[PDB]
Structures are given as structure tokens and as C-alpha cells.
Amino acid sequence: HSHGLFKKLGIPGPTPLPFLGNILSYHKGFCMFDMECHKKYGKVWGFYDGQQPVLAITDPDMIKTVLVKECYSVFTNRRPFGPVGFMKSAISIAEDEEWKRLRSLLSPTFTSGKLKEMVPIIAQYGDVLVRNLRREAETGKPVTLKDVFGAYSMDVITSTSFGVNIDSLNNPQDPFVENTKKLLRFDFLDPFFLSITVFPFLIPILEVLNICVFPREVTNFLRKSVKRMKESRDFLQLMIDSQNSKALSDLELVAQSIIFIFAGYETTSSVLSFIMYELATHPDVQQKLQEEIDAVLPNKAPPTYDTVLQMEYLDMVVNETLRLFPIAMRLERVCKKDVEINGMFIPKGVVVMIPSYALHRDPKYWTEPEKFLPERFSKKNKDNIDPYIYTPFGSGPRNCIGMRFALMNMKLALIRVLQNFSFKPCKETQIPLKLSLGGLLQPEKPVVLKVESR
Ligand code: HEM
Ligand SMILES: Clc1ccccc1C(c1ccccc1)(c1ccccc1)n1ccnc1
């Protein structure tokens, strides 16, 4: 509404400009902005994404109330996105009862057991990753990990979310890979998304203008790939089985499968790149992990679902990387009605934000927060960690529904990569690594390392 909201409410924060709000402070990035507001304004602060008031919180008792306790009542949705079109039936886009329906219809799909049946599919794609990484190893040149890791995550998310085993997509150009690489190029963030927050009044203009985020041609191609696969009779196989049992629509099923591709693409690759950078800069950790990988899996044994859940240091290396690098950076909930959370009034429409990046590097909960130290997640130090400060996958009923799949997908990759390759930085390697100023938290310069046969 007005810019005097947090002023009248007595909530500290940066002074906004008349129409821009606090967007000019974003030239440093979402992460550096949140940490600056944390050190300056203390626990709770407020800013304006143009005209939208945003209230940031830090108290874990208050974060739990927003994410867990009062989720279904008030903080059920996130800030409405831009021109969604038919993707309104996406679980990340859906709101209120429509989302609660889609969340339940897809909840049995991401279960331990249903994920256990997908591991033989994901592991087979780790083999293609090992062969393609050894290819750039023979050239004796520093490997750009974004290519190999970006290919693996794309190959896994496509076969799991569409059944089609596209196998090597580093070079082959299946009509699926053609439309997939085209559709996965429709999310450059900066186009519209940033300016949408300044002018949310332009969102309804673009929706009626028939201009959508994903080109309908690729969408039409994705529909045939579902119908032709449906005409033949693993994410699509589990949602089709849900159809044969408020039911689940066929158009809705397409939108949900598209979300899984966007969700698990740059996220899985970035983390896999963030991890290998830390394994290279801290080779004492990489060696200790390879010893555990070879102990649980001798002679480059295949990674089993149960063995991955037994490798403990692998779990510690992934968790410590996700602390230093929360890909989402923030969690956001829209206040649906005037409420008082743990002794603070939040009016209707205000977006409540949790600076995950700032909390993951807050010196109160962490010691030497900037140094990569996997032992923070040891068995002796696993209990004193607040699950509402460390939220790389969010929390509450609206958390990352693809968390178990993502961690398994990435751990299966690291096994076959570490049990066959060693990683050391080159001259082009960025020390210290710089973070991207975009909206996904990526390595500023792509991770450039060297690989060995071992
Ligand atoms: C390791 C990589 C990943 C990270 C760090 C991650 C992190 C997150 C976070 C922080 C959220 C928001 C939680 C909240 O709002 O409280 C989220 C939401 C979501 N993630 Fe992920 N995610 C990852 C991979 C995936 C994958 C592979 C999938 C698909 C299987 C996926 C599907 C989703 C969906 C559908 C939502 C929205 C849930 C809803 O709106 O109800 N994510 N993710
Ligand atoms: Cl789930 C999703 C779908 C499409 C695009 C982005 C996301 C999302 C994300 C990830 C990193 C940076 C911004 C958004 C996302 C996060 C929070 C709320 C909505 C979407 N995501 C992908 C995997 N897990 C979460």
C-alpha cells in the first residue's frame, strides 16, 4: 500500500524511494542486502519491493509460526508471480485450496520407497556422467563443471519426469532435447521478473496479451510426449497411476511435470558445482569422503539407495555446502489476514521473508560462518542446530517437495564422480569464489577444475 507502513508500525528498515522502493539496494544482490539489514536493523526489519511491503523475520519461534504453525491459515501462499498463463495449476504457482489439493495429489510421489525405485534410473545416468567427464580428462584441459553437471541434472530430471530415457544429452538432439533446451532457456530471471516487482500492475496486462513464459510450441510438444507415452500403456508414471484411483486433471499433470524440470535443473547443477569447488579448495575433506565412498562401496561399487543413506560424511559435505549456498536465498510467505505472530502485528498483504542466506551465515548460530567446515553436521553437533535457522529446503507444509529426490540425485552423482576422479584447482579457478548478483545464487565464474583418473 503506502510506504509509511513499517514507519507507522515502528519497524526499522531502509528508507524507500517514492516509486522504486528499496530496489536500488539490490545492486549488491539479494544476499548482501539481507545480511546488511540484519547487522544494522537487528532481528526484524522491513523494506519495499517497489510498492510491496516486505517484513523480514529472524526469531526461530516466529519463523516456525509462519512456516509450520500458521501455514494453512495465513501464510499459505507466496508473492504472486508474473504472467503465468496455464501454469496457474503448478504447485509452486497455485494458491490456497488449489495448492492444498495439488500438494496432496503429488505427496505420495516424493516418498522414501517411491524414490528408492528411481535410484536405478538415476544411477545409470551417473555412468554417462563418468564417461563424459573422462572425455575432457583425456584432453588434459581444465574442465568446465557446468557442462558435465548441467548435462547430468538435465538427463536425470527428464527421464524421471517423463520416462523417456534420453541417455546422453551432451550432444544428441532428440526432439525432446530440442524443446527442452529451448524451454530451459526461457528462465533468464532478469527479463520481466525484476521489473515485475516494481510494476505489479503490469502482470494482468501481459496475461491477457497471450504472451507466456514457456512458448506454447514447446508446451504443445510436451503434451504429445505425455499423450504418446500415455498411449503406450517415472514421475509421469506415478501421477498417471494417481489418475486411475477431486481427482487430477491431464492439463494439470503437464504443468506439474514442467515445474520439476525447472526446479531440478540449475539447482542440482549449481549445488554439484558448489560442492566440488569446496572439495577442491579443502582437499582434506575430498580425501576423507573418497575413503568413505570406497569403504561403503569397494572397487567403485554401484551406489545403492540404502548405502547412500549409510554414507554419513557424504551427508555432511552436502549439508555444509547448502549452508554456505542456499540456492533459494530467501523464503517468502504472503500474510493473508491481519495477525499478531509472537508479539508483532503484520497487516494483510505484507510479504514475510526469511533471509536464509543471512541466517546461514549469522555469527550467533555459527562459528567462522564463511569457512567450509563439514564437521558442523557431525553426530555430536547435529542436535544443537535449529531447523528454522538452517532452511536450505525451506520448512513447513510448503517446503521443497523435491528435497529427497534432489539429495539422492546429487549424492548418487558425487559417488561415481569421487570414486573415479580427483579434483584440484587450476590457474583459472576463482579463489575466493564469487557469488552471482542474479536471483538464483550461482558461481559468478563457472567452476574451473582439473580431473584425474585415479
Ligand atoms: C538441492 C536442490 C534444491 C533446493 C536447494 C531446493 C530448495 C527449495 C526451497 C528452499 C523451496 C521453498 C521452500 C519454502 O518456500 O518454504 C523449494 C520449493 C520447491 N521445490 Fe525445491 N529445491 C531443490 C530441488 C528441487 C527438486 C529436484 C524438485 C523437484 C522434484 C523441487 C521441487 C520444489 C517444489 C515443487 C517446490 C514448491 C513446493 C510448493 O510450492 O508447495 N525442488 N525448493
Ligand atoms: Cl520450485 C521452482 C520452480 C520453478 C522455478 C524456481 C523454483 C524454485 C527456485 C529455486 C531457486 C531459486 C529460485 C526459485 C522455487 C523456490 C521457492 C519458491 C518457489 C520456487 N525451486 C526449485 C527447486 N526448489 C525450489
Curated annotation (Swiss-Prot):
What is the required cofactor set for this protein?
A: heme
User: What induces this one?
Assistant: By drugs, such as rifampicin.
**Its membrane topology:** Single-pass membrane protein
Phenotype when changing S195P: In allele CYP3A4*2; exhibits a lower intrinsic clearance toward nifedipine
**Stated regulation of activity:** Activated by cytochrome b5.
Q: Which GO terms describe its molecular function?
A: 1,8-cineole 2-exo-monooxygenase activity; 1-alpha,25-dihydroxyvitamin D3 23-hydroxylase activity; anandamide 11,12 epoxidase activity; anandamide 14,15 epoxidase activity; anandamide 8,9 epoxidase activity; caffeine oxidase activity; enzyme binding; estrogen 16-alpha-hydroxylase activity
- Changing I259T: reported impact? In VDDR3; 10-fold increased activity towards calcitriol; no effect in protein abundance; decreased activity for non-vitamin D substrates
A GO BP entry: steroid metabolic process
UniProt xrefs under Pfam families:
p450
- Chief location: endoplasmic reticulum
Catalytic reactions on record = an organic molecule + reduced [NADPH--hemoprotein reductase] + O2 = an alcohol + oxidized [NADPH--hemoprotein reductase] + H2O + H(+); 17beta-estradiol + reduced [NADPH--hemoprotein reductase] + O2 = 2-hydroxy-17beta-estradiol + oxidized [NADPH--hemoprotein reductase] + H2O + H(+); 17beta-estradiol + reduced [NADPH--hemoprotein reductase] + O2 = 4-hydroxy-17beta-estradiol + oxidized [NADPH--hemoprotein reductase] + H2O + H(+); 17beta-estradiol + reduced [NADPH--hemoprotein reductase] + O2 = 16alpha,17beta-estriol + oxidized [NADPH--hemoprotein reductase] + H2O + H(+)
**Keyword Cell membrane on entry:** no
State what changing M403T does: In allele CYP3A4*3
Q: What is its EC number?
A: 1.14.14.1, 1.14.14.56, 1.14.14.73, 1.14.14.55
Q: In which tissues is it expressed?
A: Expressed in prostate and liver. According to some authors, it is not expressed in brain. According to others, weak levels of expression are measured in some brain locations. Also expressed in epithelium of the small intestine and large intestine, bile duct, nasal mucosa, kidney, adrenal cortex, epithelium of the gastric mucosa with intestinal metaplasia, gallbladder, intercalated ducts of the pancreas, chief cells of the parathyroid and the corpus luteum of the ovary (at protein level).
Belongs to which family?
A: Belongs to the cytochrome P450 family.
According to the UniProt entry, which disease involves this protein?
A: Vitamin D-dependent rickets 3: An autosomal dominant disorder of vitamin D metabolism resulting in early-onset rickets, reduced serum levels of the vitamin D metabolites 25-hydroxyvitamin D and 1,25-dihydroxyvitamin D, and deficient responsiveness to parent and activated forms of vitamin D.
The function of this protein is:
A cytochrome P450 monooxygenase involved in the metabolism of sterols, steroid hormones, retinoids and fatty acids. Mechanistically, uses molecular oxygen inserting one oxygen atom into a substrate, and reducing the second into a water molecule, with two electrons provided by NADPH via cytochrome P450 reductase (NADPH--hemoprotein reductase). Catalyzes the hydroxylation of carbon-hydrogen bonds.
| Misc. remarks from the entry | Chimeric transcripts, characterized by CYP3A43 exon 1 joined at canonical splice sites to distinct sets of CYP3A4 exons, have been detected. All are possibly produced by trans-splicing. The chimeric transcripts exist in 3 different combinations: CYP3A43 exon 1 joined in frame to CYP3A4 exons 2-13, CYP3A43 exon 1 joined in frame to CYP3A4 exons 4-13 and CYP3A43 exon 1 joined in frame to CYP3A4 exon 7-13. The longest chimeric isoform (CYP3A43 exon 1 joined to CYP3A4 exons 2-13) exhibits 6-beta-hydroxylase activity, while a shorter isoform (CYP3A43 exon 1 joined to CYP3A4 exons 4-13) does not.
Protein's UniProt name: Cytochrome P450 3A4
Species this chain originates from: Homo sapiens (Human)
